């Protein structure tokens, strides 16, 4: 689990892995860790899968009701604060959740909020939440700028996910990419980590320590 | 003074209870006879031949030893029987013994009387004859919409209650030493047949039940089969 | 079986009168003349007693009750209402003041509590005003000796010498005819006895009137209380010297 | 007082191109003792939906009966509209999450056909997270079956001979018979290597025609 | 509720070609003290149901009172309460299982293991098990507690699968049950020498045998054991 | 009388009939359903020319595939619309699918029938029936395009074409004479505009009449003033030509 | 207390709501005039309350019921700011007030509010003025000049002297029109004006400036004519 | 026939839009005397009509003032207390089914924001400040 | 009348006029006929529409796979009663795993109807019901009135102009009881019985609904083109 998301000129890039393990045994390698809140909002799954899915679907329903009543699309801040207020009621009951609410609105541009099960809610540019968050965050920090193209940002997300999967035993079965623009999200397919590692090693001369 | 349930008249009467008694008067004839050991008999009006025979049982059973019949608004009697079943179950749970007949009568009387204390409800439009057998012998009781109840040697209520009362008084006078069970069943059938004459131009069905020591082991059972046919033939002969 | 009587039964008339309170006052006015006189060393509360039946034991019913060891009360109006209100006042004197501050409430505060209780009956739902007027006689360390009158409307007034009942007007006139600044407890008792004898139509003995006094101290009754209800023999002895 | 227990079962759901297969062992046990040799765990809940909860027997039975009641009420309240597999999955997710703080100690697998007519298998966790998968095994023998299915269904770690591991083995269509053979072999291996696994295998197959049942014997008859 | 005080012992049961047989002892042990004797743990319901209860006996009395109340309730306004609308083993087992599961879910369980046996109205033998936690299952042979470890292996030697049920006569099943009871008295420290046995047959009906005693025991060889070396 | 749920001697509830009478005084709302969409038209009444006509919302969206129109007491319909939106969103949340139009209509009718007696053993919340009738248009994969008339009585009907409001009689007669099972969306819009012009006492303009449609492809949409004006122009040209 | 005080009549009317409207048509007149910029609220014999920094409310009818409604609206605005991190718009607040008023007309044991409300302001990050009125029945609408109050007339005058496809683009003209419309039914000079401009620019004109406006209006009337 | 004794439905409007109970209470107060309690150290109140309800309202006002003092560690402004009492009196004129209070109040209070002020309130719940009586 | 403002008031002759008005509300409804035999039970309902542009209101509601009903009068009350019956049948099937008997449902409906005729603040139901079912005792048909009176009959009819159908059923009582091998013959008998109640009307595929239950027959409803061959 790495589940990174960052902002750039073209909007928002969200990258996740798909590995779920239980007691050092890999339960699944096809886990969808991105929740489509609505055609204009995405969320990231970290911590408890059931809590994330259930409460983000509930958030999507609340956003649908808000847009029906107000005849206007809800902002990212409002949805993030609704989710945070919902979670803060259940604090101390054992809920575990770490989510990145990412959305592109006309008023606020591209926006990313981080909300945890402890009630913290903060707006930021780059976020990485997971067991292998450190490697991906380091890669992003080393190769970030508010000038990247869409293709460069997608490759940066893939590279960060690949580094996290390589250096963390609990991360990496596949890579899922999403690009959030003012007109909604675009899905950029599922890429196998095993093939991606060899492809990156062949193209870029990285991972010399690994024999291939 | 006849618009609310809990308003006294200038002479001290409650007209809603009297109107409930008037409603009871329109009901069918139901009688109960106590023997030395008890026997309950009811007349069911066959409004049309479309009704399935022996499918509209009116006599109800409480616990395994109480039998109840009622005249008036049948749903009110059913509600009262449900309340009595609840009270009997509570008593049996609390004390492990079947509820005595006087205790059951007191519970029903308290319930009916409480249904006459407020204007948010209306008094029950039924009169109930109920009885059975307990450790102290065989008991018969009659309860009215006002909540007052009494023990009787023989009781009757409904449209043809006067002829039934006259027959019961004659039977009591003619049997100072009591009656048996089968003789009581035959007398109940005869009294029902005689009291049916208040309608004449309407077919009717006779339903009989009994609850006595011996031949029923102190439990309440419906009289069905050859005994009921013998009772019907005896009633028709008279 | 539901109450469904949440609305109030006392309302304002177009002329600004409260009908139920006026009717309660009318019921009070057709009662028994009860009077109270405040003195410099005590307060006397006297009333007349009726006999429902010749076979009835009059001493089984007391028209003057002890609210606190220093506060007593008398009534004019409906007896059962007075009894229920006395029980309520006794409960309030403990559950609201004594169990918190460790002392018996002063007379004014107890009168305020009783007036609040009687006012709650004139505004809540599904009730009627109490058909009684109460005279409260008490003593407290800081306020001295006090006498109060509480009406069915819940309004209480302090009085130096007051009377209620059928002969309320004549008794009030007699009391106001000569009320000096040096009244004593025994002088107040004598004046009360004279006024009650004038108001009553006859049979003025110790078993037909009931009197109580507040003042001084009775350590002999401690087992002291300032409330003393005079016995029939003492009333007869005082009437012998009348 | 411990309100939970383990009955030691093993179930497996495989989604085909136009069919679904849900299989399970029939052994019910507790603490090295065999409660029963034939206690079915896979039930036909209606609308061509087959459900199986594994783990705590009582919680599984309660969940199955609640889901059947939900299907009945859905038919009552929506003019007998057929319940889709995704709608059933979401309803089961809500049922599981309704008692998250006192969760069912079961793992749930449901199978059917989607709105396009293809096999669909949905897997659930005890607290109510579900995902659609092609092959999913649950129980105490899941760790002994999933690698075998990955090797023999997805052809993982297999390459075309003569290419020196440059071209992966292409995926091929598998008939229902091949899925049945793979399921039987996996359950036989699980029976061989797991003490809690193996008294009889019950398989439910869902197609457009309906649901059909097959049974096979295992060791410890 | 939280811990049993007075506890029962193993209840055993099996199916034969025409019905069910269920047996249980009559001990009311108080831990290591055999405090109470002559305690009937086989409750007949109707003319076709027998309920065997093992574990806490206060809860046993509670649920037998519940069964009596259910029988009373089934007869209310039911002219066919003795012919076709009478209670069946399946209905009673479903009610008992629902009650047990509801008690478990509230963390206030009934510390019992219950075996319901009988013959259905269509002639099919019903024999099912329930306990605390609401765990239910069925088998041709059933046993609760200690008898689950010793009585079941012997009974399964006669009725091992479903197809063996039609081949088992009542005499063979009764002999197997008696032998299992003798073995349990041999090897269980909370067992008693006296027990009751109920047979439910589709043709004959309900046969109840009380005050049975374990007999034909072997103790002679114990004369040859001396010391421990 | 003198009771919210009192039966009349003829066997009807007074409050429901009075609510129907109140609805009879409302503005005209028409709905026509075809095999390629459902058109809902409403008449907007302004008590003064200074009112802004764009602030009158008598056509409300329940969900992308379900729209609603109201006639009668427009203030009472806000709670009904809120309940309908909540029910649709809840159904989508619980089943990952769009709720059927008939199911939503039944939910709305249960809400309207509720609060006098629970439809599923619940209590009451309001003390009088709703005073607004609703036309609910929608599309679902089960039956197709559906139009429902919902009344405060709790009963609903499915109509091919339905008009409600003050001019409901003549509009319904025209719908009976005009509607056939092979209409188009443009023909339905023209017919709605024609009937609205006939019913309305004032001249038909784009500032006093509003149109909306629901189709499978584009969901539920509300026409702007320019489109309504061009449709009115086309209707006038067709009337003056043929 | 749950008696249905407001129920339908045989002619399909609710008499309690109509009597609340009659109660509304008894107090001082309140006028709201909207121009190209700024909104002017005029009140006769504080009658203008700031619900938030950008919205103001005027009432006609019962004072204490209006106080209750104002408290509810202020609490709702603060809750909206706390939850959505965005100041409430005029339309949302008007909808909330109208919903409360309607809900009070369909609950047992209560009577409808005898208050008619005028809400004026500007939406956040916007410059278009917004003016709404809510009736005791719970119906709300948008206007440019309404005059909810009844003072024995003003509506006709404002209909005559408004628009012509040209709003009063200057604040001074709007204030003058409001003062003249108030003076149409007021003989003394008992007149209060509050002006609202974007960026939370809510001000109240002093009595001296209102007196100057009245004197100028009188001079204009007596000079040209 | 549960309870049809509702005394003219106290909290309803007249056909002319008036409240009968409030006007009758005003008549009762006008028939009373012509206008001595301490709410706190800085506010005093004079009562007119139905001294018992006046005492109840005065006790409620004292509790409210002491609660404000405890919460903010400052003396309550006169306007806040007057508004609270007026809202309490108005609450009985719209819901509850009970009769309205029959007390007229005259408050005189000093705060740090206005420097001596006077108010009056009636059963209708409307309170008005006055330069002089 | 002074004894008509509520259901908790008795008339001087001992009558409840609110219950009588509820009964009269049934007479203003469409005619529905029910009949049964040893093996099957059949309900035939004539539906109504608001006008030519509206559909025909449903008159048959399914309660369980072995029990159903047909209504005459206020539809919402019928919906409430049907929901209650569905809940009771589901409770019986879950707790005891036994199919609910028709007589038990009749008793439950009687009790629920009675509870609404004795307490202030409520009103009696305004719909009559014909309930058919099949259980271990065979096929059963029951008639339900809002007063709480439940009767068991071989055949009955409720609604408006119901006397013709009832007279036809009484005349042909000895015939339709023996119709056991042919469910369609029983349906034909029911259709011919309801035809006697038609007032210058013709049965169409739009205003005819036919529900049937039987031994090996789950509760099945025929409407529209399904009833083409029964006309």
Curated annotation (Swiss-Prot), chain A:
**EC number(s) recorded for this UniProt protein:** 3.4.25.1
Which stretches are transmembrane?
Answer: none
Question: Which chain positions lie within coiled-coil regions?
Answer: none
A GO cellular component annotation here is: cytosol
Active site, UniProt feature: 1 (nucleophile)
Record-level GO BP terms: proteasomal ubiquitin-independent protein catabolic process; proteasome core complex assembly; proteasome-mediated ubiquitin-dependent protein catabolic process
Q: Which reaction does it catalyse?
A: Cleavage of peptide bonds with very broad specificity
Q: Does the keyword Protease apply?
A: yes
> Molecular function (GO) terms listed?
endopeptidase activity; threonine-type endopeptidase activity
**Keywords from the named record:** Cytoplasm, Hydrolase, Nucleus, Protease, Proteasome, Threonine protease, Zymogen
**Enzyme superclass (EC):** hydrolase
Q: Main location per UniProt? A: cytoplasm
Q: Binding residues for bortezomib, per the UniProt record?
A: 49
User: Where does the record say this protein resides?
Assistant: Cytoplasm; Nucleus
Miscellaneous comment as given in the Swiss-Prot or TrEMBL entry: The side chain of Thr-1 acts as a nucleophile, and the N-terminal amino group acts as a proton acceptor.
Q: How does it assemble?
A: The 26S proteasome consists of a 20S proteasome core and two 19S regulatory subunits. The 20S proteasome core is composed of 28 subunits that are arranged in four stacked rings, resulting in a barrel-shaped structure. The two end rings are each formed by seven alpha subunits, and the two central rings are each formed by seven beta subunits. The catalytic chamber with the active sites is on the inside of the barrel.
Q: Which family does it belong to?
A: Belongs to the peptidase T1B family.
What's the protein called, per UniProt?
Proteasome subunit beta type-5
Q: Which organism is it from?
A: Saccharomyces cerevisiae (strain ATCC 204508 / S288c)
Q: Describe which stretch of the whole protein the shown chain covers, with first residue, last residue and complete length.
A: 76 to 287 of 287
From Swiss-Prot, chain E:
Report the subcellular localization.
Cytoplasm; Nucleus
Is Cytoplasm a UniProt keyword of this protein?
yes
Recite the UniProt keywords alphabetically: Cytoplasm, Nucleus, Proteasome
Any single GO BP term: proteasome assembly
Q: Which GO terms describe its cellular component?
A: cytosol; nucleus; proteasome complex; proteasome core complex, beta-subunit complex; proteasome storage granule
* One Pfam family it belongs to: Proteasome
Q: Which domain of life is it from?
A: Eukaryota
Which positions are tagged coiled coil?
none
Q: Which residues form the signal peptide?
A: none
Which family, according to the similarity comment? Belongs to the peptidase T1B family.
Report the function annotation for this chain: Non-catalytic component of the proteasome which degrades poly-ubiquitinated proteins in the cytoplasm and in the nucleus. It is essential for the regulated turnover of proteins and for the removal of misfolded proteins. The proteasome is a multicatalytic proteinase complex that is characterized by its ability to cleave peptides with Arg, Phe, Tyr, Leu, and Glu adjacent to the leaving group at neutral or slightly basic pH. It has an ATP-dependent proteolytic activity. PRE3 and PRE4 are necessary for the peptidyl-glutamyl-peptide-hydrolyzing activity.
**Oligomeric form and interacting partners:** The 26S proteasome consists of a 20S proteasome core and two 19S regulatory subunits. The 20S proteasome core is composed of 28 subunits that are arranged in four stacked rings, resulting in a barrel-shaped structure. The two end rings are each formed by seven alpha subunits, and the two central rings are each formed by seven beta subunits. The catalytic chamber with the active sites is on the inside of the barrel. Interacts with CIC1.
Swiss-Prot record, chain F:
Residues crossing the lipid bilayer are none
**Is Nucleus there in the keyword field?**
yes
Where's it found, cell-wise? Cytoplasm; Nucleus
Which residues are annotated with the PTM Phosphoserine?
48
- SUPFAM superfamilies attached to this UniProt entry: N-terminal nucleophile aminohydrolases (Ntn hydrolases)
**Alphabetical list of Gene3D superfamilies matching this protein:** Glutamine Phosphoribosylpyrophosphate, subunit 1, domain 1
Q: Name one GO cellular component term.
A: proteasome storage granule
Keyword Methyltransferase appears in the UniProt entry: no
Entries under Pfam families matching the protein: Proteasome, Proteasome_A_N
Q: Name one GO biological process term.
A: proteasomal ubiquitin-independent protein catabolic process
Q: Mind listing the UniProt keywords for this protein, alphabetically? A: Cytoplasm, Nucleus, Phosphoprotein, Proteasome
- Residue positions, PTM Phosphothreonine: 47
- Further comment: Present with 17100 molecules/cell in log phase SD medium.
In the record, the note on similarity to other proteins reads: Belongs to the peptidase T1A family.
Q: What does this protein do, in the record's words?
A: The proteasome degrades poly-ubiquitinated proteins in the cytoplasm and in the nucleus. It is essential for the regulated turnover of proteins and for the removal of misfolded proteins. The proteasome is a multicatalytic proteinase complex that is characterized by its ability to cleave peptides with Arg, Phe, Tyr, Leu, and Glu adjacent to the leaving group at neutral or slightly basic pH. It has an ATP-dependent proteolytic activity.
Quaternary structure, from the entry = The 26S proteasome consists of a 20S proteasome core and two 19S regulatory subunits. The 20S proteasome core is composed of 28 subunits that are arranged in four stacked rings, resulting in a barrel-shaped structure. The two end rings are each formed by seven alpha subunits, and the two central rings are each formed by seven beta subunits. The catalytic chamber with the active sites is on the inside of the barrel.
UniProtKB/Swiss-Prot annotation, chain G:
Which protein are we looking at? Proteasome subunit alpha type-4
Bridged cysteine pairs (disulfide)? none
One GO CC term on file: proteasome complex
Residue ranges annotated as compositionally biased, kind Basic and acidic residues, are: 218-225
The UniProt record's further free-text remark is: Present with 16800 molecules/cell in log phase SD medium.
The record's similarity note reads:
Belongs to the peptidase T1A family.
Query: SUPFAM superfamilies under this entry?
Result: N-terminal nucleophile aminohydrolases (Ntn hydrolases)
Q: Recite the UniProt keywords alphabetically.
A: Cytoplasm, Nucleus, Phosphoprotein, Proteasome
GO terms, biological process: proteasomal ubiquitin-independent protein catabolic process; proteasome-mediated ubiquitin-dependent protein catabolic process
The annotated subunit structure for this chain is: The 26S proteasome consists of a 20S proteasome core and two 19S regulatory subunits. The 20S proteasome core is composed of 28 subunits that are arranged in four stacked rings, resulting in a barrel-shaped structure. The two end rings are each formed by seven alpha subunits, and the two central rings are each formed by seven beta subunits. The catalytic chamber with the active sites is on the inside of the barrel. Interacts with CIC1.
Q: What gene name is given for the protein in this entry?
A: PRE6
* Compartments where found: Cytoplasm; Nucleus
- Classification via InterPro entries: Ntn_hydrolases_N, Proteasome_alpha, Proteasome_alpha-type, Proteasome_asu_N, Proteasome_bsu_CS, Proteasome_sua/b
Which Pfam families is this protein grouped with? Proteasome, Proteasome_A_N
């Amino acid at each position: 689990t790495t589940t990174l998301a960052f902002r750039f000129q073209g909007g928002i890039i969200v990258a996740v892995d798909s590995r779920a393990t239980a007691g050092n045994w890999v339960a699944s390698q096809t886990v969808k860790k991105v929740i489509e809140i609505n055609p204009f909002l995405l969320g990231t799954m970290a911590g408890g899968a059931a809590d994330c899915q259930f409460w983000e679907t509930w958030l999507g329903s609340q956003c649908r009701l808000h847009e029906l009543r107000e005849k206007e699309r809800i902002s990212v801040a409002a949805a993030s604060k609704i989710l945070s207020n919902l979670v803060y009621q259940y604090k101390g009951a054992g809920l575990s959740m770490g989510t990145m609410i990412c959305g592109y609105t006309r008023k606020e541009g591209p926006t990313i909020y981080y909300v945890d099960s402890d009630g913290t809610r903060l707006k930021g540019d780059i976020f990485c939440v997971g067991s292998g968050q450190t490697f991906a965050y380091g890669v992003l920090d080393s190769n970030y700028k508010w000038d990247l193209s869409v293709e460069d940002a997608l490759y940066l997300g893939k590279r960060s996910i690949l580094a996290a999967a390589h250096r963390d035993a609990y991360s990496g079965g596949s890579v899922n990419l999403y690009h959030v623009t003012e007109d909604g999200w675009i899905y950029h397919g599922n890429h196998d980590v095993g093939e991606l590692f060899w492809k990156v090693k062949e193209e870029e001369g990285s991972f010399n320590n690994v024999i291939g | 003074y006849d618009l609310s349930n809990s308003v006294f008249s200038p002479d001290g009467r409650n007209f809603q209870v009297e109107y409930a008694v008037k409603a009871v008067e329109n009901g069918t004839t139901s009688i109960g006879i106590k023997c030395n050991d008890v026997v309950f008999a009811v007349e069911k009006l066959i409004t049309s031949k479309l009704l399935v025979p022996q499918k509209n049982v009116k006599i109800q059973v409480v616990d395994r030893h109480i039998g109840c019949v009622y005249s008036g608004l049948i749903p009110d009697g059913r509600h009262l029987v449900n309340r009595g079943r609840e009270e009997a179950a509570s008593f049996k749970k609390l004390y492990k013994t079947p509820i005595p007949i006087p205790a059951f009568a007191d519970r029903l009387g308290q319930y009916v009387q409480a249904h006459t204390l407020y204007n948010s409800v209306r008094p029950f439009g039924v009169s109930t004859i109920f009885g059975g057998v307990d450790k102290n012998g065989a008991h018969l009781y009659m309860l009215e919409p006002s909540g007052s109840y009494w023990g009787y040697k023989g009781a009757a209520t409904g449209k043809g209650r006067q002829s039934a009362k006259a027959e019961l008084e004659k039977l009591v006078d003619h049997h100072p030493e009591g009656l048996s069970a089968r003789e009581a069943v035959k007398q109940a059938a005869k009294i029902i047949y005689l009291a049916h004459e208040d309608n004449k131009e309407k077919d009717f069905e006779l339903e009989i039940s009994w609850c006595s020591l011996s031949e029923t082991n102190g439990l309440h059972k419906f009289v069905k089969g050859d005994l009921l046919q013998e009772a019907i033939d005896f009633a028709q002969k008279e | 079986m539901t109450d469904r009587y949440s609305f109030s039964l006392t309302t304002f008339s177009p002329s600004g009168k409260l009908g139920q309170i006026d009717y309660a006052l009318t019921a009070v006015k057709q009662g028994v003349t009860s009077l109270g006189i405040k003195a410099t060393n005590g307060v006397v509360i006297a009333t007349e007693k009726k006999s429902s039946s010749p076979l009835a034991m009059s001493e089984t019913l007391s028209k003057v009750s002890l609210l606190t060891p220093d506060i007593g009360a008398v009534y004019s109006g409906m007896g059962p209402d007075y009894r229920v209100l006395v029980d309520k006042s006794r409960k309030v004197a403990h559950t609201s003041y004594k169990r918190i501050y460790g002392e018996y409430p002063p007379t004014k505060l107890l009168v305020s509590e009783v007036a609040k209780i009687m006012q709650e009956a004139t505004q809540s739902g599904g009730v009627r005003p109490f058909g009684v007027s109460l005279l409260i006689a008490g003593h407290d360390e800081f306020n001295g000796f006090s006498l109060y009158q509480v009406d069915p409307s819940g309004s209480y007034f302090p009085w130096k010498a007051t009377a209620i009942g059928k002969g309320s007007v004549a008794a009030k006139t007699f009391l106001e005819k000569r009320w000096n600044d040096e009244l004593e407890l025994e002088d107040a008792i004598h004046i009360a006895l004279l006024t009650l004898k004038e108001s009553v139509e006859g049979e003025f003995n110790g078993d037909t009137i009931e009197l109580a006094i507040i003042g001084d101290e009775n350590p002999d009754l401690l087992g002291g209380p300032r409330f003393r209800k005079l016995t029939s023999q003492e009333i007869n002895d005082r009437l012998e010297a009348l | 007082f411990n309100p939970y227990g383990d009955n030691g079962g093993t179930i497996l759901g495989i989604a085909g191109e136009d069919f679904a297969v849900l299989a399970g062992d029939t052994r019910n046990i507790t603490d090295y003792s065999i409660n029963s040799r034939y206690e079915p765990k896979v039930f036909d809940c209606g609308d061509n939906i087959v459900m199986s909860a594994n783990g705590f027997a009582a919680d599984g039975d309660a969940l199955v009966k609640r889901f059947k009641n939900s299907v009945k009420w859905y038919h009552f309240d929506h003019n007998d509209k057929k319940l889709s597999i995704n709608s059933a999955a979401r309803n089961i997710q809500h049922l599981l999450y309704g008692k998250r703080f006192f969760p069912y100690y079961v793992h749930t697998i449901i199978a059917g056909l989607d709105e396009d007519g293809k096999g669909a298998v949905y897997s659930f966790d005890p607290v109510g997270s579900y995902e659609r998968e092609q092959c999913r095994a649950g129980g105490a023998a899941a760790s002994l079956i999933m690698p075998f299915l990955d090797n023999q269904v997805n052809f993982k770690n297999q390459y075309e001979p003569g290419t020196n591991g440059k071209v992966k083995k292409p995926l091929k269509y598998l008939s229902v018979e091949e899925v049945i053979k793979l399921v039987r072999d996996s359950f036989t291996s699980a029976t061989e290597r797991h003490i809690q696994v193996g008294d009889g295998l019950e398989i439910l197959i869902v197609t457009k025609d309906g649901v059909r049942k097959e049974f096979y014997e295992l060791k410890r008859d | 509720t939280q811990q049993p005080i007075v506890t029962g012992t193993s209840v055993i049961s099996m199916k034969y070609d025409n019905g069910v047989i269920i047996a249980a002892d009559n001990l009311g042990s108080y831990g290591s003290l055999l405090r109470f004797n002559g305690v009937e743990r086989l409750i007949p319901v109707g003319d076709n149901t027998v309920v065997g209860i093992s574990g806490d006996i206060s809860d046993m009395q509670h649920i037998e009172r519940l069964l009596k109340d259910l029988v009373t309730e089934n007869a209310y306004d039911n002219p066919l309460a003795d012919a076709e609308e009478a209670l069946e083993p399946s209905y009673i087992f479903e009610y008992l299982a629902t009650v047990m599961y509801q008690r478990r879910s509230k963390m206030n369980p009934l510390w019992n293991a219950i075996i319901v046996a009988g013959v259905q109205s269509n002639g099919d033998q019903f024999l099912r098990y329930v306990n605390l936690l609401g765990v239910t299952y069925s088998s041709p042979t059933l046993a609760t507690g200690f008898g689950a470890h010793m009585a079941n292996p012997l009974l399964r030697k006669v009725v091992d699968r479903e197809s063996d049920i039609p081949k088992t006569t009542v005499q063979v099943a009764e002999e197997a049950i008696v032998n299992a009871m003798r073995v349990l008295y041999y090897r269980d420290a909370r067992s008693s020498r006296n027990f009751s046995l109920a047979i439910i047959d589709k043709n004959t009906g309900l046969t109840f045998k009380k005050n049975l005693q374990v007999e034909n025991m072997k103790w002679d060889f114990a004369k040859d054991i001396k010391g421990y070396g | 009388d003198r009771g919210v749920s009192t039966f009349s001697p003829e066997g009807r509830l007074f409050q429901v009939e009075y609510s129907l009478e109140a609805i009879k005084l409302g503005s005209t709302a028409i709905g026509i359903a075809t095999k390629e969409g459902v058109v809902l038209g409403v008449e907007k009444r302004a008590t003064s020319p200074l009112l802004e006509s764009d602030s009158i919302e008598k056509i409300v969206e329940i969900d992308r595939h379900i729209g609603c129109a109201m006639s009668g007491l427009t203030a009472d319909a806000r709670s009904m619309i809120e309940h309908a939106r909540t029910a649709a969103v809840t159904h989508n949340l619980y089943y990952d699918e769009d709720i059927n139009v008939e199911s939503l209509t039944q939910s709305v009718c249960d809400l309207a029938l509720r609060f006098g007696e629970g439809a599923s053993g619940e209590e009451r919340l309001m003390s009088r029936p709703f005073g607004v009738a609703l036309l609910i248009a929608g599309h679902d994969a089960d039956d197709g395009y559906q139009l429902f008339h919902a009344e405060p009585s709790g009963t609903f009907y499915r109509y091919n074409a339905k008009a409600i409001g003050s001019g409901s009689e003549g509009a319904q007669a025209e719908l009976l004479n005009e509607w056939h099972s092979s209409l188009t969306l443009k023909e339905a819009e023209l017919l709605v505009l024609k009937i609205l012009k006939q019913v309305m006492e004032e001249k038909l303009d784009e500032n006093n009449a509003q149109l909306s449609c629901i189709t499978k492809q584009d969901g539920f949409k509300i026409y702007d003033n320019e489109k309504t004006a061009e449709l009115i122009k086309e209707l006038k040209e067709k009337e003056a030509a043929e | 207390y749950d008696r249905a005080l407001s129920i339908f009549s045989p002619d399909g009317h609710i008499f309690q709501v109509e009597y609340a409207l009659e109660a509304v048509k008894r107090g001082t007149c309140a006028v709201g005039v909207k121009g190209k910029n700024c909104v002017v609220l005029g009140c006769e014999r504080s009658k203008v309350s700031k619900i938030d920094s950008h919205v103001v409310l005027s009432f006609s009818g019962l004072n204490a019921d209006s106080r209750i409604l104002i408290e509810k609206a202020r609490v709702e605005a603060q809750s909206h700011r706390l939850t959505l991190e965005d100041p409430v718009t005029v339309e949302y607040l008007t909808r909330y007030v109208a919903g409360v008023q309607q809900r009070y007309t369909q609950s047992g044991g209560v009577r409808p509010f005898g208050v008619s409300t005028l809400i004026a302001g500007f939406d956040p990050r916007d410059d278009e003025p917004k003016l709404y009125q809510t009736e005791p029945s719970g119906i709300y609408s948008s206007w440019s000049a309404q005059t909810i109050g009844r003072n024995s007339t003003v509506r006709e005058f404002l209909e005559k002297n408004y628009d012509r496809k040209e709003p009063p683009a200057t604040v001074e003209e709007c204030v003058k029109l409001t003062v003249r419309s108030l003076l149409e039914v007021v003989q003394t000079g008992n007149i209060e004006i509050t002006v609202v401009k974007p960026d939370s620019d809510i001000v109240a004109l002093s009595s001296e400036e209102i007196n100057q406006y009245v004197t100028q209006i009188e001079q204009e009337k007596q000079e040209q004519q | 026939m549960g309870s049809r004794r509702y005394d003219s439905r106290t909290t309803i409007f007249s056909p002319e839009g008036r409240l009968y109970q409030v006007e009758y209470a005003l008549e009762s107060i006008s028939h009373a005397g012509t206008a001595l309690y301490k709410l706190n150290d800085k506010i005093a109140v004079a009562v007119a009509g139905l001294t018992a309800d006046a005492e109840i309202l005065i006790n409620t006002a004292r509790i409210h003032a002491q609660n404000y003092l405890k919460t903010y560690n400052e003396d309550i402004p006169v306007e806040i207390l007057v508004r609270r009492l007026s809202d309490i009196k108005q609450g009985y004129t719209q819901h509850g089914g009970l009769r309205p209070f029959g007390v007229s109040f005259i408050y005189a209070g000093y705060d740090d924001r206005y420097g001596y002020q006077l108010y009056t309130s009636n059963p209708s719940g409307n309170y008005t400040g006055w330069k002089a009586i | 009348n002074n004894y008509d403002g509520d259901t908790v008031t008795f008339s001087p002759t001992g009558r409840l006029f609110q219950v009588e008005y509820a009964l009269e509300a049934i007479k203003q409804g469409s005619v529905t006929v029910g009949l049964r035999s040893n093996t099957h039970a059949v309900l035939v309902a004539l539906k109504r529409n608001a006008d030519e542009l509206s559909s025909y209101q449903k008159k048959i509601i399914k309660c369980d796979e072995h029990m159903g009903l047909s209504l005459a009068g206020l539809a919402p009350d019928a919906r409430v009663l049907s929901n209650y019956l569905r809940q009771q049948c589901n409770y019986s099937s879950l707790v005891f795993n036994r199919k609910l008997a028709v007589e038990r449902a009749g008793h439950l409906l009687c009790d629920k109807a009675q509870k609404n005729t004795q307490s202030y603040g409520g009103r009696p139901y305004g719909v009559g019901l014909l309930i058919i079912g099949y259980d271990k005792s065979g096929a059963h048909l029951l008639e339900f009135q809002p007063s709480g009176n439940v009767t068991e009959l071989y055949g009955t009819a409720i609604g408006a102009r119901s006397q013709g159908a009832k007279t036809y059923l009484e005349r042909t009582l000895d015939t339709f009881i023996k119709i056991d091998g042919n469910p369609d013959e029983l349906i034909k008998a029911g259709v011919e019985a309801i035809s006697q109640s038609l007032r210058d009307e013709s049965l169409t595929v739009d205003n005819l609904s036919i529900a049937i239950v039987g031994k090996d027959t789950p509760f099945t409803i025929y409407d529209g083109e399904a009833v083409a061959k029964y006309i």
